[PDB]
Design a protein around this motif. Structure first.
Motif, PDB file in Angstrom:
ATOM      1  N   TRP A 299      -3.655   9.916   4.927  1.00  0.00           N
ATOM      2  CA  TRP A 299      -2.949   8.908   5.713  1.00  0.00           C
ATOM      3  C   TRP A 299      -1.533   8.635   5.228  1.00  0.00           C
ATOM      4  O   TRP A 299      -0.820   7.879   5.898  1.00  0.00           O
ATOM      5  CB  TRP A 299      -3.741   7.604   5.716  1.00  0.00           C
ATOM      6  CG  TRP A 299      -4.259   7.229   4.369  1.00  0.00           C
ATOM      7  CD1 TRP A 299      -5.492   7.501   3.866  1.00  0.00           C
ATOM      8  CD2 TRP A 299      -3.557   6.515   3.348  1.00  0.00           C
ATOM      9  NE1 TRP A 299      -5.604   7.004   2.594  1.00  0.00           N
ATOM     10  CE2 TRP A 299      -4.427   6.394   2.252  1.00  0.00           C
ATOM     11  CE3 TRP A 299      -2.276   5.967   3.255  1.00  0.00           C
ATOM     12  CZ2 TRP A 299      -4.060   5.748   1.081  1.00  0.00           C
ATOM     13  CZ3 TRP A 299      -1.914   5.332   2.094  1.00  0.00           C
ATOM     14  CH2 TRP A 299      -2.803   5.226   1.021  1.00  0.00           C
TER      15      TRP A 299
ATOM     16  N   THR B  29      -3.009  -3.964   6.483  1.00  0.00           N
ATOM     17  CA  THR B  29      -1.790  -3.165   6.500  1.00  0.00           C
ATOM     18  C   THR B  29      -1.020  -3.330   7.804  1.00  0.00           C
ATOM     19  O   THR B  29       0.206  -3.473   7.790  1.00  0.00           O
ATOM     20  CB  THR B  29      -2.137  -1.697   6.276  1.00  0.00           C
ATOM     21  OG1 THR B  29      -2.957  -1.579   5.113  1.00  0.00           O
ATOM     22  CG2 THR B  29      -0.885  -0.877   6.081  1.00  0.00           C
ATOM     23  N   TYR B  30      -1.718  -3.324   8.939  1.00  0.00           N
ATOM     24  CA  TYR B  30      -1.102  -3.321  10.263  1.00  0.00           C
ATOM     25  C   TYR B  30      -1.598  -4.532  11.043  1.00  0.00           C
ATOM     26  O   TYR B  30      -2.559  -4.432  11.817  1.00  0.00           O
ATOM     27  CB  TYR B  30      -1.426  -2.035  11.019  1.00  0.00           C
ATOM     28  CG  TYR B  30      -0.666  -0.821  10.557  1.00  0.00           C
ATOM     29  CD1 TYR B  30       0.600  -0.553  11.034  1.00  0.00           C
ATOM     30  CD2 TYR B  30      -1.222   0.064   9.658  1.00  0.00           C
ATOM     31  CE1 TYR B  30       1.292   0.555  10.619  1.00  0.00           C
ATOM     32  CE2 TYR B  30      -0.534   1.175   9.237  1.00  0.00           C
ATOM     33  CZ  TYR B  30       0.722   1.415   9.721  1.00  0.00           C
ATOM     34  OH  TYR B  30       1.414   2.523   9.304  1.00  0.00           O
TER      35      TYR B  30
ATOM     36  N   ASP C 255     -10.208   7.470   6.841  1.00  0.00           N
ATOM     37  CA  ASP C 255      -8.791   7.349   6.542  1.00  0.00           C
ATOM     38  C   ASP C 255      -8.156   6.099   7.128  1.00  0.00           C
ATOM     39  O   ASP C 255      -7.018   5.780   6.775  1.00  0.00           O
ATOM     40  CB  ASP C 255      -8.038   8.578   7.058  1.00  0.00           C
ATOM     41  CG  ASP C 255      -8.330   9.823   6.254  1.00  0.00           C
ATOM     42  OD1 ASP C 255      -8.603   9.701   5.045  1.00  0.00           O
ATOM     43  OD2 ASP C 255      -8.283  10.929   6.830  1.00  0.00           O
TER      44      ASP C 255
ATOM     45  N   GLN D 149      -8.563   1.389  -1.179  1.00  0.00           N
ATOM     46  CA  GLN D 149      -7.230   1.860  -0.775  1.00  0.00           C
ATOM     47  C   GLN D 149      -7.270   2.638   0.545  1.00  0.00           C
ATOM     48  O   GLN D 149      -6.989   3.834   0.598  1.00  0.00           O
ATOM     49  CB  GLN D 149      -6.573   2.705  -1.877  1.00  0.00           C
ATOM     50  CG  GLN D 149      -6.743   2.174  -3.296  1.00  0.00           C
ATOM     51  CD  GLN D 149      -5.761   1.077  -3.638  1.00  0.00           C
ATOM     52  OE1 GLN D 149      -4.602   1.346  -3.943  1.00  0.00           O
ATOM     53  NE2 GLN D 149      -6.219  -0.167  -3.593  1.00  0.00           N
ATOM     54  N   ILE D 150      -7.632   1.938   1.615  1.00  0.00           N
ATOM     55  CA  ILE D 150      -7.721   2.511   2.953  1.00  0.00           C
ATOM     56  C   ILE D 150      -6.904   1.632   3.891  1.00  0.00           C
ATOM     57  O   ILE D 150      -7.025   0.408   3.832  1.00  0.00           O
ATOM     58  CB  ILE D 150      -9.172   2.617   3.453  1.00  0.00           C
ATOM     59  CG1 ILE D 150     -10.005   3.489   2.519  1.00  0.00           C
ATOM     60  CG2 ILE D 150      -9.230   3.189   4.845  1.00  0.00           C
ATOM     61  CD1 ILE D 150     -11.475   3.458   2.826  1.00  0.00           C
ATOM     62  N   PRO D 151      -6.051   2.199   4.740  1.00  0.00           N
ATOM     63  CA  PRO D 151      -5.302   1.380   5.699  1.00  0.00           C
ATOM     64  C   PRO D 151      -6.192   0.702   6.729  1.00  0.00           C
ATOM     65  O   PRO D 151      -7.200   1.249   7.185  1.00  0.00           O
ATOM     66  CB  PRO D 151      -4.366   2.392   6.360  1.00  0.00           C
ATOM     67  CG  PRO D 151      -4.240   3.483   5.373  1.00  0.00           C
ATOM     68  CD  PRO D 151      -5.548   3.579   4.686  1.00  0.00           C
TER      69      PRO D 151
ATOM     70  N   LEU E 120       0.819  -1.210   0.000  1.00  0.00           N
ATOM     71  CA  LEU E 120       0.000   0.000   0.000  1.00  0.00           C
ATOM     72  C   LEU E 120       0.853   1.260   0.000  1.00  0.00           C
ATOM     73  O   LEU E 120       0.623   2.164  -0.812  1.00  0.00           O
ATOM     74  CB  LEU E 120      -0.943  -0.004   1.200  1.00  0.00           C
ATOM     75  CG  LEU E 120      -1.899   1.182   1.284  1.00  0.00           C
ATOM     76  CD1 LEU E 120      -2.790   1.213   0.072  1.00  0.00           C
ATOM     77  CD2 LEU E 120      -2.719   1.108   2.545  1.00  0.00           C
TER      78      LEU E 120
END
Ligand SMILES: [K+]
Ligand SMILES: [K+]
Ligand SMILES: [K+]
Ligand SMILES: [Mg+2]
Ligand SMILES: [Mg+2]
Ligand SMILES: [Mg+2]
Ligand SMILES: [Mg+2]
Ligand SMILES: [Mg+2]
Ligand SMILES: [Mg+2]
Ligand SMILES: [Mg+2]
Ligand SMILES: [Mg+2]
Ligand SMILES: [Mg+2]
Ligand SMILES: [Mg+2]
Ligand SMILES: [Mg+2]
Ligand SMILES: [Mg+2]
Lengths: 116, 90, 47, 127, 101, 99, 48, 128, 75
Positions: D25, F67-68, F26, F47-49, D7
């Motif tokens: 972000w 992502t996390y 976001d 496309q968002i974390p 990403l």
RNA sequence: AAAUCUACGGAUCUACGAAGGAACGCCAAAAGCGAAGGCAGCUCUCUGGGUCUCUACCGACGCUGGUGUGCGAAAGCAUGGGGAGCGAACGGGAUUAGAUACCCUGGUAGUCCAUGCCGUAAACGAUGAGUGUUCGCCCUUGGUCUAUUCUGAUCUGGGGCUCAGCUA
């Protein structure tokens, strides 16, 4: 707890005739004969899988099977042909590896020479 | 259920031990399956082969339809005492 | 790696949680037939 | 889309070439990147303790024994088998024959059971 | 090899007939250079069905067992027992290490 | 999220009526272990974390869009500890701007 | 030497079989004791 | 040598795609050790260690995720010192990235060093 | 299979005979009797169809028993 | 639905007995064995192959393979037997507009055994043989080691589901 056979004296002539080779099976006779022919052809004292030992055992097995096997039994004659071709492969190996062992095997077992 | 083990079967299974082999036939005279005793496939093969050999030898019934139920030690005759009944009820 | 191998030399920290032990007790050949378990579910479990 | 990368790298490559506007972000992700850890060969090693064989029989020994979890305690207070194994590890630690160490640990466990029983009896005495 | 010979005599055959036939088979084994190690009898047994012969149907029989160490060709010339009139069934099997009884 | 501007209709008591967010988020913080919702798939599409806690048996398809990842078993104590760290960090950042 | 150690233990096992067969030979049947042992087995008449 | 060389190279690529850390190769050869030394110098593997090289060899290689494909030729291919660059422009799939490893009288070299030394020989394979 | 009737209760004797014909396995074989001849190439097809049906019933009973045993034992 | 057929010279049905031929219920199957075709009652004889263990022997002796050679469902062919059941051809009774067919009733060659010939099948996993590598989960055939009383590990073949990868 002592069994009944530990009282009467044992019999020597009956245990002598118990082990007469007419009382053993053909597989046991073949095991004894193959163990005999291994010892003549061994190179070392513990040698059991060298080429000339395998050739002697294969020749004994071929000579037994070629007479014993029935004509109508076609599933074991394929194994006999396999024995023949494995013996050919081992002789082909020995002819270029050890000429002394090749000549010894041919002379003692009465086979012929083919470079083809 | 009755507890039977593969080792027990492999030590006892022979066509001369008809009393032990009679555990594995039904009232129809047919052979019990493997899944309702839990023994291994080798044990089931040995049991079936020994019961077949005993049937050929004559110690066990091929089938029990039309005859009495097979239990060990008593005759398979069709005598007059197979169908004893009562008359004092009438 | 250091700390987790240290704390293995302590009390019994590898104890199964209640949910996992309860699922083990939930689990502990073949099954009941469909025409039998459906009769059980038709009679009971309507409460 | 058909771009490659994760990403942060895909978004950085997109916003460098003036394809998309900058998302909010992006700066937070650049200030705090996601974690990375080295390659692991796909192999998990089964963790074992030296006290494991002595723990084993300890359920046969002193047959079933203590249980300090249904009795929700804490993941630090040992559990009978653990203290018995620790004693025999440090016991045998000093040469002492294995079976003799098992006997002298068994005797002290049973003396502890008698001590606990007389503690409960005096509990009933002052109850 | 090691063989067990199992014989099922008819229920009316008497002790002298049993001894005569078993002695005949034993003399066969001795002539063909064998050893007899154990002779035993199971008495009267009960059959699962009626064994049918020329005389009639029989429902009990007398079981005999002889253990021998003989030639591999022993079963080929034990074939005169198929035409025997004191016998119901006969069977030669190899030896198994299973307790009997 | 991929259709956050579609119309809604009032019907009944229902499961109550709720529109979408007016503003695109976001970041998405997920507490879904049984995978009941498509939130990870929609956030990957848009496309968002994503901050989420991963099980040992998570699929690769769902894992690669996270992502996390935070590798743990989501017990009550760890969920409280996670949310406590998040709340304390956010309010400590908020105080630095005088708010 | 490891082959020699294996060859002795197999020869060791074969010989003790022959000895056990030898001490079990006391209950075999002579041709002059055929009928006596047949009649004695008929007298015994073990269970099924 | 060509069968075991291609065997080890395909083992390396197959384990690269699974994201592993180490590979073990057995049987080994001196040609294989020199090929791996060339790969380490060009930076496609991090380290490699050879164990028991005169009785029964085994090689442990540590990977980092940088090699795309390794081939070893299964046939005889001659090359002179002045054909190296024209052969390289037709052997590598991208024609820019990758090295052709040939064997020479001066040793086992790659294709860029053998141009400088002006020596040809047999093409062993390439990695890119 | 013979069943004796006691005290003139024919229905109990018939139920006992039916259950014994069931549990001896003879009812399965008496229903498996064929009227015509089937080749081995058709025995294979019928055995395959039997196996597929059995697998479907196994899945059904597994799922039904799992959802029964989740609820019934205090959950 | 009927008819041909068969039965008062006593059939079908019921009990006992006799003959003869073929196939081997239950076990029993996503099991097992074989290079493939294939192989099912049981006992013995002879024989081919396979799996596991070894601080045993030998030392690259290996893989594939045109021309060649061998094996090879079923039907069919030649000589000699056998013939219960089934059944090409054929006779008869029905159906139909016709019915050289489907349905019914008889039934020859054949199916079976010994010795030979031919050499083909949807001979199909519609997938040539071999070598090396690649995340797992659940069953199972035959072993071996460890067990801590119930299990773990490692080989060997057979099955179900799947991460990747591949695919019109
Ligand atoms: K094989
Ligand atoms: K070959
Ligand atoms: K599938
Ligand atoms: Mg197979
Ligand atoms: Mg034919
Ligand atoms: Mg003819
Ligand atoms: Mg017809
Ligand atoms: Mg007509
Ligand atoms: Mg007919
Ligand atoms: Mg063709
Ligand atoms: Mg076929
Ligand atoms: Mg081919
Ligand atoms: Mg196993
Ligand atoms: Mg496998
Ligand atoms: Mg995919």
């Amino acid at each position: 707890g002592t069994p009944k056979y530990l009282l009467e004296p044992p019999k020597d002539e009956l245990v002598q005739t118990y082990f007469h080779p007419d009382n053993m099976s053909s597989a046991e006779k073949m095991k004894i004969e193959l163990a005999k022919v291994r010892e003549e052809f061994k190179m070392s004292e513990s040698d059991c899988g060298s080429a000339r030992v395998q050739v002697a055992q294969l020749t004994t097995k071929i000579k037994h099977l070629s007479s014993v096997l029935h004509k109508k039994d076609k599933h074991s004659k394929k194994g006999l042909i396999a024995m023949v071709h494995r013996r050919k492969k081992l002789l082909k190996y020995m002819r270029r590896t050890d000429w002394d062992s090749y000549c010894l095997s041919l002379s003692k077992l009465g086979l012929r020479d083919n470079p083809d | 259920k009755a507890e039977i083990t593969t080792e027990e079967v492999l030590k006892k299974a022979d066509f001369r031990n008809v009393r032990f082999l009679a555990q594995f036939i039904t009232e129809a005279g047919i052979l019990v399956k493997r899944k309702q005793t839990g023994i291994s496939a080798k044990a089931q093969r040995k049991i079936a082969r020994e019961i077949k050999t005993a049937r050929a030898f004559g110690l066990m019934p091929f089938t029990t339809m039309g005859t009495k139920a097979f239990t060990f030690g008593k005759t398979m005759e069709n005598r007059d005492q197979d169908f004893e009944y009562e008359v004092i009820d009438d | 790696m250091h700390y987790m191998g240290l704390f293995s030399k302590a009390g019994n920290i590898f104890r199964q949680p209640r949910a996992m032990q309860a699922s083990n007790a939930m689990l502990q050949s073949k099954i009941f037939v469909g025409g039998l378990s459906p009769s059980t579910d038709v009679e009971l479990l309507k409460e | 889309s058909w771009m490659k990368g994760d990403l942060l790298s895909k978004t950085r490559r997109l916003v460098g070439g003036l394809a998309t506007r900058e998302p909010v972000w992006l700066k937070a992700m650049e200030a705090s990147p996601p974690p990375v850890f080295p390659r692991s060969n796909g192999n998990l090693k089964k963790i074992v303790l030296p006290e494991d064989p002595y723990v084993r029989r300890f359920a046969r020994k002193h047959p079933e024994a203590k249980l300090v979890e249904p009795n929700k305690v804490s993941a630090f207070i040992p559990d009978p088998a653990r203290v018995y194994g620790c004693r025999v590890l440090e016991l045998t630690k000093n040469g002492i024959s294995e079976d003799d160490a098992m006997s002298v640990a068994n005797m002290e466990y049973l003396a502890e059971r008698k001590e606990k029983k007389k503690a409960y009896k005096r509990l009933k005495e002052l109850a | 090899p090691l063989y067990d010979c199992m014989l099922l005599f008819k229920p009316i055959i008497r002790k002298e007939g049993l001894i005569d036939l078993v002695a005949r088979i034993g003399k066969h084994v001795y002539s063909k250079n064998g050893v007899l190690t154990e002779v035993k009898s199971f008495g009267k047994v009960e059959l699962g069905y009626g064994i049918k012969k020329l005389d009639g149907r029989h429902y009990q029989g007398q079981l005999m067992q002889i253990t021998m160490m003989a030639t591999p060709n022993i079963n080929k010339e034990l074939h005169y027992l198929n035409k025997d009139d004191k016998l119901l069934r006969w069977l030669l099997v190899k030896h198994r290490d299973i307790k009997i009884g | 999220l991929t259709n956050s501007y579609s119309p809604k209709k009032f019907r009944s008591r229902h499961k109550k009526l709720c529109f979408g967010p007016t503003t695109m988020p976001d970041c998405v913080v997920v507490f879904d272990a049984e995978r009941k919702s498509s939130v990870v798939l929609e956030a990957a599409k848009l496309q968002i974390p994503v901050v989420a806690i991963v099980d040992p048996n998570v699929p690769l398809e769902f894992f690669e869009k996270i992502t996390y990842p935070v590798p743990a078993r989501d017990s009550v104590k760890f969920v409280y500890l996670f949310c406590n760290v998040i709340t304390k960090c956010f309010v400590a950042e908020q105080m630095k701007m005088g708010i | 030497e490891f082959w020699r150690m294996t060859g002795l233990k197999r020869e060791e096992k074969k010989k003790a079989r022959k000895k056990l067969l030898h001490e079990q030979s006391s209950l075999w049947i002579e041709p002059k004791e055929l009928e006596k042992k047949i009649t004695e087995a008929l007298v015994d008449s073990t269970t099924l | 040598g060509r069968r075991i060389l291609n065997d080890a190279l395909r083992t390396i690529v197959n384990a690269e795609r699974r994201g592993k850390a180490s590979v073990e190769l057995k049987p080994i050869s001196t040609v294989m050790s020199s090929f791996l030394r060339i790969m380490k110098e060009k930076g496609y593997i991090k380290n490699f260690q050879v164990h028991d090289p005169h009785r029964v060899g085994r090689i442990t290689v540590d990977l980092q995720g940088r090699v795309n494909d390794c081939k070893a030729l299964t046939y005889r291919q001659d090359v002179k010192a002045k054909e190296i660059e024209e052969y390289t422009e037709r052997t590598l799939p991208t024609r820019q990235w990758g090295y052709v490893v040939v064997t020479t009288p001066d040793g086992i070299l790659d294709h860029e060093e053998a141009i400088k030394r002006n020596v040809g020989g047999q093409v062993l394979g390439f990695f890119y | 299979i013979r069943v004796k009737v006691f005290s003139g209760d024919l229905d109990k004797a018939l139920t006992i005979l039916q259950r014994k014909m069931q549990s001896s396995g003879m009812e399965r074989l008496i229903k498996a009797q064929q009227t015509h001849h089937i080749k081995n190439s058709e025995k294979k097809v019928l055995a395959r169809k039997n196996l597929e049906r059995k697998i479907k019933s196994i899945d059904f009973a597994r799922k039904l028993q799992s959802i029964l045993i989740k609820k019934v034992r205090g959950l």
